[PDB]
Structure 1
Amino acid sequence: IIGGTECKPHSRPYMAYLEIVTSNGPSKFCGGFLIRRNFVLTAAHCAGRSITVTLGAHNITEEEDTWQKLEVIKQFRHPKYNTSTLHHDIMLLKLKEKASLTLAVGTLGRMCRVAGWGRTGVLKPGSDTLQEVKLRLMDPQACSHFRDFDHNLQLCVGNPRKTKSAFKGDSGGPLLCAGAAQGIVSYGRSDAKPPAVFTRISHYQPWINQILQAN
């Protein structure tokens, strides 16, 4: 998160920290969010050989009793997810156990908020602490320069005149508008120049409910 503020600890108890494992490279990291006790929503580009979800985190380097490190038993990438275009960049993670409900862990032109543990700058390292930034929802034409952006599939997010932006490692986290998740952090420019592309959750609601009722 670039240009944001450290969240009040555990003020966003649905936030998930994903440690993704690959067979040929080191750990990667994404965000996500708990929508059911045993289901986390994230971006499909965050898929890997195996994922661990940490719920209840603020400072992700200091283990605390709020933490719930939960095994993921299966990854549900959108069946139409495309690695070239990043269309349908959405994925459900089924947790091994149902998470405990705690004060720190629970389920979930307008301005919206996005939170994450990603880098605070292009050449800055990932954040120790969960950070949040307020971003503007833009008309689709502001994301035209992303040639594979599509208004029905995706939100365009972030005033280009500001440096405020999600960035590397914030992938998969929710964009919340007036209290409700509307978007999932997907992609943007290597120079962190806003705006960025977010998955439009509403388009995928039928698909989400199909997976949830089948598992």
Structure 2
Amino acid sequence: IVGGSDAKEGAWPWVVGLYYDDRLLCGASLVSSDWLVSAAHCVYGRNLEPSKWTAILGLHMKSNLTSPQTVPRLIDEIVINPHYNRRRKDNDIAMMHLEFKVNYTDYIQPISLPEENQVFPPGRNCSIAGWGTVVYQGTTADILQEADVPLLSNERCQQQMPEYNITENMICAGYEEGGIDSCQGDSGGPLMCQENNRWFLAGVTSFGYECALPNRPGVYARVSRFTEWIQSFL
């Protein structure tokens, strides 16, 4: 997360760190007692042996894994979206099963899915979080980073990303001036929007042109388009 700040303990109890080979590579979002939503590209090429992935729930700081609020879980099933296209980056979403269920605490809670036509309108501030790089091509965060980013229209996002195919399966967020954005290591994590004092998983952190550049927004897989598919696992 570029231009964010340190999240407090228990700020985003749905945020999950995904470890492969003892390295935190991607984020994820807890959506039930045993299912995570993440990005397909995180797990592409590494889904045949799901027990190579470890989810750390209730994580705040990577340098304090052994604290009472954290819970580790091996993944025993990974289901990439059947319409995932690697080259075009479309439908960049995946389901990941926890081998054993988690009990909910102040630090571990599921995030609500959107309603199937739910509108998170352009100009509204939503939130992002993760342990990814803090500047483009820089170092990873120790403490979980958070930031607020305003949503774009898909038309405006397409104009700003003419080298990419911005589809209806994507939602974009970023500042005109840059400075605040997701980055490498944050993918698979949430874009969360609040409405009526309830947080909703509006997006899954997917891609962009570098990070934090002016008029180069974060592109997120639009979760409302996959609600029905996600709900079939729960």
Aligned partner of 1:14 in structure 2 is: 14
The size of the alignment, in residue pairs, is 207
Evaluate the alpha carbon distance shift between residue 85 and residue 106 of structure 1 in structure 2; reply closer, same or farther with a 3 A threshold: same
Aligned partner of 1:172 in structure 2 is: 188
Distance 2:42 2:130 in 1: 14
Evaluate the alpha carbon distance shift between residue 27 and residue 11 of structure 1 in structure 2; reply closer, same or farther with a 3 A threshold: closer
Q: Does the 8 Å CA contact 1:20/1:46 hold for their aligned counterparts? A: no
- In the alignment, residue 107 of structure 2 is paired with which amino acid? A
5 Å matches for 1:49-64? 49=49, 50-63=52-65, 64=67
CA RMSD across the alignment? 1.5
Match of 1:79 among 60, 79, 82: 82
> What is the TM-score of this pair, normalised by structure 1?
0.91
Aligned partner of 1:190 in structure 2 is: 210
Match of 2:103 among 100, 103, 120: 100
Q: Find runs of 4+ consecutive structure 1 residues off by over 2 angstroms.
A: none
Distance 1:27 1:82 in 2: 25
> What is the TM-score of this pair, normalised by structure 2?
0.84
- In the alignment, residue 97 of structure 1 is paired with which amino acid? F
Distance 2:224 2:62 in 1: 30
Q: Does the 8 Å CA contact 2:208/2:219 hold for their aligned counterparts? A: yes
Which structure 1 segments of 5+ residues have no match? none
Q: Does the 8 Å CA contact 1:186/1:197 hold for their aligned counterparts? A: yes
Aligned partner of 1:127 in structure 2 is: 141
Distance 2:76 2:201 in 1: 24
Distance 1:143 1:8 in 2: 31
Q: Does the 8 Å CA contact 2:15/2:29 hold for their aligned counterparts? A: yes
Which structure 2 segments of 5+ residues have no match? 112-122
Q: Does the 8 Å CA contact 1:138/1:159 hold for their aligned counterparts? A: no
- In the alignment, residue 7 of structure 2 is paired with which amino acid? C
**Identity over aligned pairs, percent:** 29
